[PDB]
Amino acid sequence: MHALISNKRKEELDKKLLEAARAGYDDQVAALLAKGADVNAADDVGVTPLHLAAQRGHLEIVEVLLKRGADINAADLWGQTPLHLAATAGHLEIVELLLRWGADVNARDNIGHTPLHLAAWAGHLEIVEVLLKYGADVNAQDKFGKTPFDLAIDNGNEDIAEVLQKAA
Amino acid sequence: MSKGEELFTGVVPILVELDGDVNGHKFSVRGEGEGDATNGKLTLKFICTTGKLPVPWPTLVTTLVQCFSRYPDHMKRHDFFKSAMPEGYVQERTISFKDDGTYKTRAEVKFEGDTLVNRIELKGIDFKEDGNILGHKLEYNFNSHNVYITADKQKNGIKANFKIRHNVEDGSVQLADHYQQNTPIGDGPVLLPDNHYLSTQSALSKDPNEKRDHMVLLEFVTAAGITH
């Protein structure tokens, strides 16, 4: 039928968009977006093009996808948002862009980690400062009761621990 | 050594294949996911594909990849798993449950194609029929544990031992003592770590769109113990 053919072609377009976003082809991403691909498409595990673009550090693709209507607060099977992946990867510009566009700064994954938790765990000072600028909760606690200061102090991070101590 | 470290410099797909029999019952679980060795992140999903699993899911968490554990820059010399990866290693496990049956586990971890494959063989004996395990009396959660790794100096492997504490639905803790030993497969010099330990965190979830026996797992692992 025409309906089934339309659905199959749309699914092929969504798969092509996801592959292009993972690979980092901005031209193909824009071309597929113009042709009618779904910007909110997801895998079987719930991973969206914004997730891959933010995790792999494609700033231009992230900004292009934001202007089309990509949900900036979307969780996969493991409860991660694009801000979580961007903060744990260490991309400062994508984190800043997500925060400006209105990313939730106090979202929690399946373990209760916040973006500040992952920023302290990975060991990026600039991301910690940027997240604290926009109103991150220093005293957040995960399921096991650990705090972003504890994760910093027990992982060998020194300057991040000092900053978190100053922030109280 | 350095080649294994260079291998784990990004997101690596992970395939896990387990087949086993406990008290005669037969099952085989297939799992797929991704791992990030830079931060110790692991995101996996497991399916039973043979019906209903005869045992509670958490009991198989420790059996279902030590090479994706984060090691700080001052501990890079104590990374045995990455140093022996391109060919893989062999894990022998004895899981003695408290006042219940035991598990014997033989696994091989190899790097095939672009993916990392963990192949496991299980054998469970002496389990009761009204007990927590075979009676399905364990709840859906997982705690955090410390795994102590020491050297062997004779078999080019390492030794480990720890205790998993499960949670019964009646407010009780069941203690499963795990004994482990790792041996290399390929014939090449590998790093032999000093005595240290690994800290672990896990979170078990559920997929609302899967109509089978599934288990979603998110896991973080790090190394500690040594001061530099």
Author numbering:
A (entry chain A): 155 to 322
B (entry chain B): 1 to 64, 68 to 231
Quote the study on this structure.
A potential workaround to the size limitation in cryo-EM is to bind a small protein of interest (the “cargo”) to a much larger carrier (the “scaffold”) in order to make it large enough to visualize readily. The rigidified scaffold described here provides a number of advantageous properties for cryo-EM structure determination—size, symmetry, and modular binding—making it suitable for future applications to many important systems.
Before employing the candidate cryo-EM scaffolds to image a protein target of major biological importance, we compared their performance in a test system, using the well-studied superfolder version of the green fluorescent protein (GFP), 26 kDa in size, as the cargo protein. When bound to the imaging scaffold, the overall molecular weight of this complex is 972 kDa. Based on data processing of similar numbers of particle images from the five candidates, one design (designated RCG-10) appeared to offer the most rigid presentation of the bound GFP cargo protein. Following data processing from ~877,000 particles obtained from 3,575 cryo-EM movies, a 3-D density map was obtained in which the resolution of the central core of the scaffold was 2.7 Å, with a resolution of 3.1 Å for just the GFP component. The level of atomic detail is illustrated by the density for the GFP chromophore and side chains from the neighboring amino acid residues. The binding of GFP to the DARPin did not lead to meaningful differences in the backbone, though a different rotamer is seen for a tyrosine residue (Tyr39). For the new 3.1-Å cryo-EM map, ModelAngelo built all 156 residues of the DARPin domain correctly (100% success), including sidechains. For the GFP cargo, the program built 220 of 231 residues correctly (95% success), including sidechains.
